[PDB]
Design a protein around this ligand. Sequence first.
Ligand SMILES: Cc1cc2nc3c(=O)[nH]c(=O)nc-3n(C[C@H](O)[C@H](O)[C@H](O)COP(=O)(O)OP(=O)(O)OC[C@H]3O[C@@H](n4cnc5c(N)ncnc54)[C@H](O)[C@@H]3O)c2cc1C
Lengths: 56, 112, 1205
Amino acid sequence: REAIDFLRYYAEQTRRTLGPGHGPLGPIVCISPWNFPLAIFTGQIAAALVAGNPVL
Amino acid sequence: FGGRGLSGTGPKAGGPLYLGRLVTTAPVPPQHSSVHTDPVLLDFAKWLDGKGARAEAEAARNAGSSSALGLDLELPGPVGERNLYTLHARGRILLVPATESGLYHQLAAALA
Amino acid sequence: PAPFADFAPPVRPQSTLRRAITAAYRRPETECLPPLVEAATQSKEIRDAAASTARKLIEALRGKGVEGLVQEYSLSSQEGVALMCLAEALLRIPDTATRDALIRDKIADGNWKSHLSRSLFVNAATWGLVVTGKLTSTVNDRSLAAALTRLISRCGEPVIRRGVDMAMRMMGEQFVTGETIREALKRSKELEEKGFSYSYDMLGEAATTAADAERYYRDYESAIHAIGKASAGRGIYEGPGISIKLSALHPRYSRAQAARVMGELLPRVKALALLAKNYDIGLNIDAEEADRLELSLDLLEVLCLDGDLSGWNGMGFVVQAYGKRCPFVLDFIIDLARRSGRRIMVRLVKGAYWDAEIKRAQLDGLADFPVFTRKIHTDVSYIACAAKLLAATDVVFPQFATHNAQTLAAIYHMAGKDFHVGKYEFQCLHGMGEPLYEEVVGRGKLDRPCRIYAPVGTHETLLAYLVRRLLGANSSFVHRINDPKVSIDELIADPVEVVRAMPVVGAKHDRIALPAELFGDARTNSAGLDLSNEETLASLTEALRESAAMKWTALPQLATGPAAGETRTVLNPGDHRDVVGSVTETSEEDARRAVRLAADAAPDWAAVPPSERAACLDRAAELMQARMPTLLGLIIREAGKSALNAIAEVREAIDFLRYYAEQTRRTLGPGHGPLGPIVCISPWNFPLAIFTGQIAAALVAGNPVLAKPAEETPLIAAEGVRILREAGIPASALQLLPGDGRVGAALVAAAETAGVMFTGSTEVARLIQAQLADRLSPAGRPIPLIAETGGQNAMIVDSSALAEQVVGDVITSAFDSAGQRCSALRVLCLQEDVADRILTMLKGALHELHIGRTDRLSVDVGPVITSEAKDNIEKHIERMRGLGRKVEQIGLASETGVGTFVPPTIIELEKLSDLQREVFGPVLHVIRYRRDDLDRLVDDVNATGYGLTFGLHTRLDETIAHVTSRIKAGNLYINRNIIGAVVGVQPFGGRGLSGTGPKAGGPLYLGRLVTTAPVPPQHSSVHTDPVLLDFAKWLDGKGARAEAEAARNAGSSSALGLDLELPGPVGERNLYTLHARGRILLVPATESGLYHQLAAALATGNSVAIDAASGLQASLKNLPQTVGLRVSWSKDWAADGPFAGALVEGDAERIRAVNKAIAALPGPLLLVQAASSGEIARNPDAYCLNWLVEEVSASINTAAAGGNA
Ligand SMILES: Cc1cc2nc3c(=O)[nH]c(=O)nc-3n(C[C@H](O)[C@H](O)[C@H](O)COP(=O)(O)OP(=O)(O)OC[C@H]3O[C@@H](n4cnc5c(N)ncnc54)[C@H](O)[C@@H]3O)c2cc1C
């Protein structure tokens, strides 16, 4: 559920905020832990992706 | 979710400042504003006016207005719970200026 | 001239029909409804038929703008409001190509702020209503600025373009029919061809100056020509007409100014009507506030009887069905139509001022409302009045203005089958009612005509009252037809049958308080008097005349009986030929005897249980209420007050009596022993209310009182004492000692005087302070002094404020009571971009004031109290004039020669510091400020050292937050005048040079008048000062365990941070908060005493200055930085001030010595608390935390945007 929530939350935050002047950083390295191996994994990746950055 | 000090850098995950850190110009998050103006920022702006540092005084007043310090929101959630989100001062900010005008702008940002 | 012989004569003798109107003014709602229900009743067959027609109309309305924009660009509510505000501002750019360039090149590229002295969001409350349907009194301009930046950065130029085009259509085609009458007339041809007609509303309203009324006249005259030319002989039923508001045509349109209205406003309406007659068009008189209804009837009567207007039936008049007088007004108008033979056009409406009528009746303490309190009652009233109108179509032309399809259907079937054009019509609002009435007009529908009420005006004009026009309320029909939660069956419900079947027909709304019940179970509100009610004016006229025939006296009323002395007369300040009465002044020996008598009787009065002492006060309030008309006449003639201000003063005295009685019943027990004899010294400017309040508080707290009234106004004081004694206060508990400062000084100096309550000048208060510092109580403690003194009160106005509203509040604040209020507005601060416009309006409004002897209702401003006050005030004005400052003064009539008058005066200053003394008269000073310098201006206001009342006019939350957080004043007022603080609602009292506190009419007041203070109602705080907490940890680190525990107990017992909303009228929020006082002077003797003093001061939020002569510096080594920030040491106390209070430790002689040194400090009179070392060890309450916090009252007008959410 937390993974789903991160995806939908950062999707909605994007729809509320990002326009052409909010340029991406570029490649983002996302390093996640073993204790929330889907939720934190998904949240960091979803946020970097939806902001326009490719993710490692 | 997320903390201060040895607990992390922020901004909080699953909160409205998060995406702004992943772009080179941060947007204005939803509901991110405050009607409060730091009173020390105000005193600094008047001091800058006294010195004739007009561009800096203007930048200080603009920082005092656009600061979201004192934001205090209730977030939608389940019944039987009250979920609150507030923005406070961070602490002491390290300023590393190169020029006098740069120092004035940095002070304005931190005081506001 | 005989007193009150010309007080308020009616325009004409009141006919039987006019008397029935006045009789209904505030009739109980249970009495109004049954006859309306009976008159609105229709047959079962007609009710079924009407339900069917209304269902049919509502079916089409539901099967047929900003919302599509919000959807297309996924805007939040704040983004939609911000966008519409941006669009409005872009539309203020006249040239299209320039505007489009700003959008494309500079706005859409961000940094909208750089390109657009006035907030973008001044009108956001109005757009908020458009976008969200909800009303906000003030604007969160920081939220809107964030939303605007977000939406522009997200969607760019396309959303700006759509917003501009949307705003252009709404403001140019929907909220108005057109920007000018010519454009409105061109756009009316479409619907006239379909069977509609038009009435044009030139959006004129509430003239403030003669020049404004002149502009409104020529605007109406020019529209009449354009409409009459366009009408081209179509006549008053087929062709267009005009609607006017009488308040647009004269700046003093009120019953109080009825003579000016009949002499100056009437000929202007006649000249417009003569032009409407020549073109043969309708001229409708719109209905306004309830207190203007009957005055407007006097103009309607003269016009309908004027032979010069004969032959024309175009004159029209609005009647509001939400008003209790509506059927009786209609009876009167129908009779007038019969007598004059003019077929009066009667526009029946529900009414547009409902929220305002509720608030006004509550503020004025009147018996009831002049409007209904349940929407369904107004609906029944409308249908009943339609039945009366439809029975008189031969002599009047009814015009049923309504968007409610149920109301429409009921009237359509009530009118029956016979119809011809000219029999009656419906009416609707432009851009609102056409949907409904396109199902009505024409042979294919109901074949009944509809006249469109068509606003005409620019964007500026339209926006000024758009809020009122939208109120859109949850109960409104158009809100419900567009609410999916409401079925058709709910919409076609018969309000007559719903009301008929309610348990109590016509019961008041459960959630609206009658004015008497504003405070619920706590106490009974005082009742006022309606000076727009002819019966009240006639009865008051007789009482005032009878009051001037009484031989008023004031004598030294000692415990043993009246005493002899030097007797002289008391003169009316407006006319020294009018002798009001005689005063016998007290000898210094008898004043000293009086204190000893009070001392001897103190145990007996202290033994009367607090409840019974409070019963005395409640009995006195009842007596003053019943005697108000007689008290009015005395106050008018002795103190020079207007009748309006005298009513408020008697109300205040009643409120003080009832408030302190209730506070006594809430608090006082056997452990709160009285101080002893208390000397009460009261001023001449509120000679009954402040006099009563000080004496009532001291008495109900168990103290015997020596009452020293101002030398100028002993008569009302003597009458006050008479009433208190009649109410049961024994003569030994309340002695009256008339006389000058010798009497006051003898009383203050008497050894048995245990406390002094003083209201007056700072100069005298400082002399009393020095006298008292000579003495100690028998317990060896300072004599308490409550000293309430003047203020140099300011109002700050920014470019978002509404000029008309500002000017009215400024005129009232500065010149009411000839500026002889402690709260009066002395300095007006105008943002530079609007200063010239507001000053022009202010000067014009100044010259509309009537100055003279106050025994006429028409007088706005009376005399100043003495020739000495006059000379002092005029010397100031001439100094300012001699310095080249601009000085505006109204000319005075020759009759003022027999009294002491100062004309209301406006003086334009360069800097606030140009004003170097308090000027206690009708003298307003004006300064201008640049917006960026607002924070410095507040600094300048604070720097005077005064801190009584302060006003702010702004719509912007950021400016409200800033200014109210930085200003240092006891009574704050937002978007209203700054005078007339209401007991228990705006507890009154300032800081600094303005007073010691505690606030009069507030919950800390009685506790100052007993040896051990009680816990006031609601007096607590869950907040703990964090510097106090740091100090308590430091004390524990030093091993001072007992002190550390006392510090934590002080942190919990402090009420710093209390934040309450006080009950009061609707449309206002009244807040009461406890803040730190400032820097407290600490004069310790021992290390432990210092620690206890520091804890008390820190727990209440204060900084401290510790006497360096104590030698206790080594007692505070290694203080935490947070505590060090609040601690200073002082060798020269006078140099390190001002202080906000003091704590002293010592034996009796040390306390007396320190108390004298404190009294010699320049500036504010310090509230000093003293204790011995042993007392600090034995009594945890040795220092009382009540006196280490500052009370702040804030009153916010939440109706200021044009309505009450
Ligand atoms: C053509 C035209 C001309 C008008 N001229 C004037 C004018 O000169 N003067 C004037 O004062 N107004 C005027 N009005 C406004 C009118 O008085 C109504 O208030 C408004 O138009 C709505 O009434 P309704 O029958 O359309 O809608 P409804 O939803 O049926 O009625 C709403 C009305 O109910 C009343 N009401 C709401 N709440 C309560 C309550 N709690 N207790 C008692 N009553 C309540 C109010 O009067 C409110 O306006 C005019 C309206 C029109 C269309």
